[PDB]
Structure 1
């Protein structure tokens, strides 16, 4: 019995297994990683020995994800995660590589929140039990699952087209649309609000916080269909489903008072989603 990654690299106590993730919202649970495309095992003596592999209780997330509960799909069936009991067995009865049919999910706890996971960091500590139908061999070992690429795991029922958006305005004056859409695994009554450092009493102009050679007299103002969106004011999108819906935002310049002088302009504006 032996296992390898999607890279073909053999999985060796404990082993560090690096996998690629494509996290995503599903209905009622969010995918963290589908390990069935990442981990493959086989049987070295299938004509005389059948191998069995289970997921032992105590298997759980690690790193930034250790705070979240969810589920594990093991060989087509769902179990609480962290696991509280041993799963049924997967059988390996062939020399040909077969997937380790495991997918790790997260219970949605936000509207459209996300947790950044960087490459090289631990996402899960999995405990396996290996037996056979031939002798009394019964051993446990640990697989530490590491991310092999930078991702963001969605923690909500909805997800965005991008977590970090950089837009460039034309030289003053001028406007640029902000590319940003949202969708939900199932239909949700969804809204959003802006936050950031504002310059005016009406909280309608985000301050020019450019560090190097900043301009004077101007800030950034966002509109939606020609209407000013002030900070901390919920924009309703109505019911949002699986079809991507634009937030409908456009960036503009706006005068903050006094003489307008040459220099750089920058504003960092947060978007936060809420259920309505």
Structure 2
């Protein structure tokens, strides 16, 4: 089982930065939609759904730093979850050698930030833990953490 970010090199476990461009200017009540399907893809290293990989996102996945006061929802594989995750998500099966974009979007609504900076350029905005286990033997379980990082400042000048 392997993943990559923005078509980069293979990732088999561990923590990886994922850089995203965000709507730079927003108003009170407006959300930010972070489509991570456009950035992270994973595949099965045998193909043919031999030793299918089973992946889900993990309880405890959360906003980072100042964003923990913000409201969040996480879309994963046809289901919406409150964010931060207080449970694990449903399981996605991965068996093809051709990468599958992760069916993952983060919806963010800033709270208590009106009149200033909402998100800083270069700041980790969320840490999303992903769990993999396959089918044969031990399943060789692996942990991934996706550190979502904003490429740019976001401001909410009004309110």
Band the TM-score falls in, shorter-chain normalisation? 0.7 to 0.9
Aligned length: 154
Structure with larger RCO (C-alpha < 8 A, sep 6+): 2
The equivalent of 2:47 in structure 1 is 46
Structure 1 stretches of at least 4 aligned residues deviating more than 6 Å after TM superposition: none
TM-score, with length taken from structure 2:
0.80
**Equivalent position of 1:127 in the other structure:** 129
Deviations 1:31-73 (A, max 9, x none): 3421100001111113321111100110001133223231100
Equivalent residues in 2 for 1:67-216, closer than 5 Å: 67-107=69-109, 109=111, 115-119=118-122, 121-137=123-139, 139-147=141-149, 149-152=151-154
Partner of 1:30: 31
The corresponding residue for 1:222 is none
Post-superposition Cα deviations, 1:117-168, rounded to whole Å, max 9, x if no partner, equal 212x2121111111223333263524141425113176xxxxxxxxxxxxxx
Counterpart of 1:183 in structure 2 is none
Distance 2:139 2:102 in 1: 20
Q: Structure 1 residues 136 and 77, CA, compared in 2 at 3 Å: closer, same or farther?
A: same
- CA–CA distance in structure 2, aligned partners of residues 38 and 94 of structure 1: 18
Partner of 1:137: helix, strand, or coil? Answer: coil
Go from structure 1 to structure 2 and tell me whether the alpha carbon gap of 1:7 and 1:138 turns closer, same or farther (over 3 Å shift): closer
Residue 41 of structure 2 aligns to a residue whose secondary structure is strand
RMSD, matched Cα? 2.7
Q: Is the 8 A contact 1:50 1:132 kept in 2?
A: yes
Partner of 2:158: 272
Report the Cα distance in structure 2 between the residues aligned to 1:87 and 1:40, rounded to whole angstroms.
Answer: 18
Residues 29 and 40 of structure 1: CA distance in aligned 2, closer, same or farther (over 3 Å): farther
Deviation at 1:90, TM superposition (A): 1.2
Change (3 A) 1:66 1:13: farther
Distance 2:77 2:155 in 1: 23
SS in 2 for 1:3: strand
Partner of 1:9: 9
- How many angstroms does 1:83 deviate by? 0.6
Unaligned stretches of 5+ in structure 1?
A: 155-270
